[PDB]
Symmetry: D2
Subunit: 338 residues, 4 copies
């Protein structure tokens, strides 16, 4: 009994797929959704239909102004302002800030005031809000914190992998590269982008050397690896799934077969679920729907020697991350209401 | 005597290429450009680097605060209010309206007001402004018209074909389908499009059924075929170039051999440069950068009997259409500034 | 009261997806496969992981030199000469020819030579073998026919619809187009295509116009439409699913809504499972893994008048067809063992 | 005086752009082509039409069963057996082996057999044949060397950069990843690929881990870094232009500015034409048609510290390589003739 009641503000890509993960894992209960740029009737469409993840494997309709999903009514809102959503009346405790526009404790506090929702969870790396990665520092969550962060989805891939290698071979220093699928933030043709010019170029016809602090933010998830990690991104013409290309220096001399054994041991043990291990000839479509945060590709990895190796790990940047959002809630609820 | 002095508002896709089309024909003069979102710095980049048509053939730079393009200086503005764009100062007598917002004559007249833009040229269909398709209703244009429209890119492909077939076999009735490359109006991944839900889907993994106002608009350019034409569109994962698929009944008998030689005589004849004829094994990429408005494909056209055929005409939806913007001005300036 | 014993020749994308359909429907028992390019280990890989239809839904492994799927054992062979495949020892009574090398009756008699397979179904449209379409002329199968084809997948889409529209309102004539996905017969980059130059172009870069008799082949399954139907094909950068574009002149006039009503009933009638009817804002990726032969889109298709209408219908060119292959065999098992 | 007379075996993708780059640079003279699968008529269409690089810039016709290009004549052959090709009658001194079937000194000598061809160049890396990268070790060519290799596209990118680095700051140890466009060896959809399973997968649906022997191969070109550097590749859905992602440890402490200057100086100096330096916010498609082997991207490269950095260099994996083949030939005809 006593499941966590959850609400969502920002029904984007990384906000609808989080909703999918909820009815799958069944670890929490969604009760509310708010998005002013999306109509209610539209919402059923975007849930039922998805070009990446297929149609919803349940029942979706409308009960009397409420979105019924797999036999569960959810109230819908559409306030331009985030502090104009009455979470209390829906019974929501934890709000998911997936609009990605209120990524600060000051802005996200707009959900918490007037006693409405207790904790706010930002589905992006935050500057002031304490970021968390379910693999590593999910336990660092103290009850006195309201607005958290689940870091970036590249971070959710690298950080768990970094922990294993570092804790077992000691990562002296490393540089990361993520071959990232394109995201909502890109253009179908050479369009406007007054800030990030490269990010405006046609998404299908370009390899776009983007940037990311995800690897640099691994330091915030793993403090022992602070300033020892950073890296950039390549955004390539694929709808979903991404891979991390880590190259680093280990403290202990270890052969690749040794590395494999440790990772295989982690993905089976304490990281059963966050980290996964395979030795198959996979590509970036064998992971569409993977709940894991990192899938170590043993085969594609290469070792120059025993102190300098290149590692590769996949992740569903959309759905793996979505699941880790659902996990962070369960943990909190487990921690605040117990 | 002189060349027409031209200005451009809305440095979009179908706007930057119109510019690129001016330094090629060199039939007119671009003097001013206006776009609030895209600064001068950015304008150079957007012009110089293009994922579809390649790097600009020439030296694009800045000088003394204004934009320069192979020894010609272009004044630059960032006014969000068309009424406050100073065309009068710049010397812009002709303005191309490529923002998508302004379509009404009384709307496009915010450019004309108060001693600046002589004629307003809307690079999009207008349901009140007299639409005109060069090569068809070209000379049908009157000097007493303050705002005109060039209609859609697609309709600029069908009409020059429609005319030929009509003016020789008389098109009884016909339905058109255009397999269209995606446009800036779409989403790279499943996104918000409250009006047109299907154009909210991932443009790169989907064949998206649309509906265009290009086919009946041929009735607006060719009155004889008014109401005899209509048809919808298909958006597919290519960055540029589209093809018209015209299915129609004829009034007179036709051997497809005749229709061929009819088009060939119209391509090299009066419609030289507007309508083109080909027999080659062409594919969409074979028309990137093409200046033709319609390129009839001989072998790809199918014919059921002597009266009911299916024609096929290619076009660069971006660059072919941007040329007819330029040519129209040479016609106006002929008629409208003399 | 028995089940068909099925063998597969040609382990391409139809061959594998036919197998998936067999375990999804569980109406036939696949007992053998043959592909001189694909060994036992690889087959597992190709069955397990699939870029388009995701991972195999069930159990696949190997055992005692035999492929094992969901508990059923499947012999594996690598014969390049079809007359060298031991269909008798394998107990395969029905052989699926999907190599394309054997489409004629006599080139198909290899599997039947010297008491072996009883029947052979050609997944490719044939020149002499009796072509059929499930939902149109299933019951036209005689027990004496050794070779028999299942038309094309393009053919299997338009055929059910025609037996509705023409069956009710009569299309005096009609032309067809199919915006097809790309198939394994194509090239990643510009390459060789000796006899059909257009097909050897960048499949991801291009819209490729290709001829197809799959619309002329309608006359074979519906004699009444012999010479009344024919069409072409466009191939676009999408991995799977295609749409049929039918522009036909109807004898008995009907409004765009009257015809919708006709197709409704057909979806819930005897073709319940063949012809489907939808009214949703659908795009191509919605019908991935769909078992229908033809899904009519009421929102897409439009009508010029009452006698001249355009219809749009979707189909999974890979999986939908594979489903019909299965349905045909289990039907054949009914007759031979009646 | 005399210009290099060249023949091409295998008019595939790479052998077809070599011809292109030849007439572009006009530094050598192509006199003979051979490809059994491509006849004269087809050969012309493959030149006039390119999905990636557009139409060829020149008059290409056929004079008397012979291919005429820009006024230069080229005799064609469809000899499957390279030892049957009359390179002597054609007067081809330097032959380009562009089919991967003849990549050893014994297997390549069929061109030189019986006094015709006097030098042969392998468009792919070779086992025993000495490889060369123009700008790095083209001066190690000896008049005695009858058969050579130009390594691979990727090697020609990594090497000019590595030379600069290792010479200025010394690369202690290094690892490389190349985000590479797909090539003719891949499939449009999941197809057979017995030796390399991942490459069987649909080229345009997946990110595909592959292996390149182009990083250790630098070791054969620069022994100083043999065993000290290696790497792999990710295959992504793009038609052309790849990028190299080089992570390495510098023996000398170097700041990023200090690195930026290191490359800018060599791109203007002796590596002018080979290595290029840029600071613009570019993407892959900005390099289609680039005649450079390596284009250093400053804004995309990063530095963890003064001794651990990540460098990025673009390259047209199709046409940058073909230009170097022409330079390898021009260099030999010099040395060969003296």
């Amino acid at each position: 009994m006593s499941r966590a009641k959850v609400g969502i503000n920002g029904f984007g890509r990384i906000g609808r797929l989080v909703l999918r993960a909820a009815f799958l894992k069944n670890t929490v209960d969604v009760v509310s959704v708010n998005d002013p740029f999306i109509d209610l009737e539209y919402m059923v469409y975007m849930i039922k239909r998805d070009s990446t993840h297929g149609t919803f494997p349940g029942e979706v309709s409308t009960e009397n102004g409420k979105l019924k999903v797999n036999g569960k009514l959810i109230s819908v809102h559409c306030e331009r302002d985030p502090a104009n959503i009455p979470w209390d009346k829906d019974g929501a405790e934890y709000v998911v800030e997936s609009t990605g526009v209120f990524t600060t404790i000051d802005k996200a506090q707009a959900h918490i005031k007037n006693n409405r929702a207790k904790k706010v969870i930002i589905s992006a790396p935050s500057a002031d809000a304490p970021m968390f990665v379910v693999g590593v520092n999910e336990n660092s969550y103290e009850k006195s914190m309201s607005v958290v962060s689940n870091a970036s989805c590249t971070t959710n891939c690298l950080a768990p992998l970094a922990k294993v290698i570092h804790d077992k071979f000691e990562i002296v220093e490393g540089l990361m590269t993520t071959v990232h699928s394109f995201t909502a933030t890109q253009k179908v043709v050479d369009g406007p982008s007054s800030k990030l010019w490269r990010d405006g170029r046609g998404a299908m016809q370009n390899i776009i050397p983007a940037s990311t602090g995800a690897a640099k933010a691994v330091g915030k998830v793993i403090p022992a690896l602070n300033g020892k990690l950073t890296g950039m991104a390549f955004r390539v013409p694929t709808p979903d799934v991404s891979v991390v290309d880590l190259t680093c220096r280990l403290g202990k001399g270890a052969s690749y077969e040794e590395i494999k054994a440790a990772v295989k041991a982690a993905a089976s043990g304490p990281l059963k679920g966050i980290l996964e291990y395979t030795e198959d000839e996979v590509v970036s479509s064998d992971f569409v729907g993977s709940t894991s945060s990192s899938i170590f590709d043993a085969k594609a990895g290469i070792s120059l020697n025993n102190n300098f190796v290149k590692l590769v790990s996949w992740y569903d940047n959309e759905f793996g991350y979505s699941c880790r959002v659902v996990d962070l809630i369960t943990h909190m609820h487990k921690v605040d209401h117990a």
